[PDB]
Amino acid sequence: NYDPFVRHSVTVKADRKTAFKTFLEGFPEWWPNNFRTTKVGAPLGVDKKGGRWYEIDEQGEEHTFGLIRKVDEPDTLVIGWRLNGFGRIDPDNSSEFTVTFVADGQKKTRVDVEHTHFDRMGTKHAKRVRNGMDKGWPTILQSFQDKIDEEGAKK
């Protein structure tokens, strides 16, 4: 995945609404690696007005993940992510990802990511982005599943 082709699948033990609300609304309601406020995990994060990402800090907008291409209800979501790096020119490219929501019996949900274009361009960029994003991206994904699973089926 990631380099030869981008494809990730997440299983939700809840409903279509609960899964969407915890991703586009519930920001400071997580836990995995957001043991802070203002600087990370602000009472917003996601912008459902124009279609972008922006955290709210005491001095203004701090960090951002990327931008949103289209918001076709809690069914189709297209987004674009940036990359890490310290002493490097701003990544004027970004990678696009297609998110598809599948509902199973309304009591179960499945979400997959499909794309083929800005994925097969990693290699050197792979190690570059994995030097920051990997230290939380795959970790939060696994934790998200268990979190929603608990707030639905487990509890």
Distance (Å, whole) CA 109 – CA 86: 38
Distance (Å, whole) CA 145 – CA 13: 8
Distance (Å, whole) CA 46 – CA 24: 6
Distance (Å, whole) CA 62 – CA 104: 38
The residue length of the chain stands at 155
Encoded amino acid at 77, one letter? L
Distance (Å, whole) CA 130 – CA 8: 16
Encoded amino acid at 115, one letter? H
CB count within 10 Å of CB 133 equals 15
Solving technique: NMR
Torsion of CA 77, 132, 138, 143, to 10 degrees: -100
Where do the domains of the chain lie, and which CATH numbers do they carry?
Answer: 1-155 (3.30.530.20)
The answer to whether the Cα torsion of 34, 35, 38, 40 is positive or negative is negative
Of residues 139, 95, 98, the one with CA closest to residue 115: 98
Taking CA atoms, 149 is separated from 7, 10, 31, in Å, by 22, 11, 14
Of residues 151, 143, 155, the one with CA closest to residue 18: 151
CB count within 10 Å of CB 53 equals 19
Distance (Å, whole) CA 1 – CA 114: 11
Distance (Å, whole) CA 110 – CA 119: 22
Of residues 134, 126, 94, 97, the one with CA closest to residue 112: 97
Of residues 40, 38, 46, the one with CA closest to residue 22: 46
Secondary structure letter of residue 74 according to DSSP: G
